[PDB]
């Protein structure tokens, strides 16, 4: 029960990391989106391998 906050946080995060995209309540399967943070790591990779 001392690490009960840990399992409660991970229980949300497992549902949240594979969060699904709903259009009008309808789930669109095969909807691939690239994050703003994922795309900003593609930039910082590309900026660092050009700077080197």
């Amino acid at each position: 029960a001392k690490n009960a906050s840990e399992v409660s946080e991970l229980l949300a995060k497992s549902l949240a990391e594979k969060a699904v995209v709903t259009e009008g309540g309808k789930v669109v399967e095969g909807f691939s989106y690239v994050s703003k943070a994922v795309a900003a790591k593609v930039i910082a990779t590309r900026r660092a391998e050009v700077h080197e």
Binding site: A48, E49, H51, E52
Partner: protein, 49 residues
């Protein structure tokens, strides 16, 4: 004996960005020209004798 620039060009290209500036004095020295070292004398050779 390849030339010194294509050794500089290769060994800078195959050096990652983290260890680049540490490894620049070992590329400066690997492509410095040879100046042969002074042996001890043992002078007065056969044509000087």
């Amino acid at each position: 004996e390849g030339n010194s620039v294509a050794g500089i060009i290769k060994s800078v290209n195959e050096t990652s960005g983290a260890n680049l500036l540490s490894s620049l004095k070992t590329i400066k020295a690997q492509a410095a020209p040879i100046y042969p070292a002074a042996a001890s004398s043992t002078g007065y050779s056969t044509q000087a004798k």
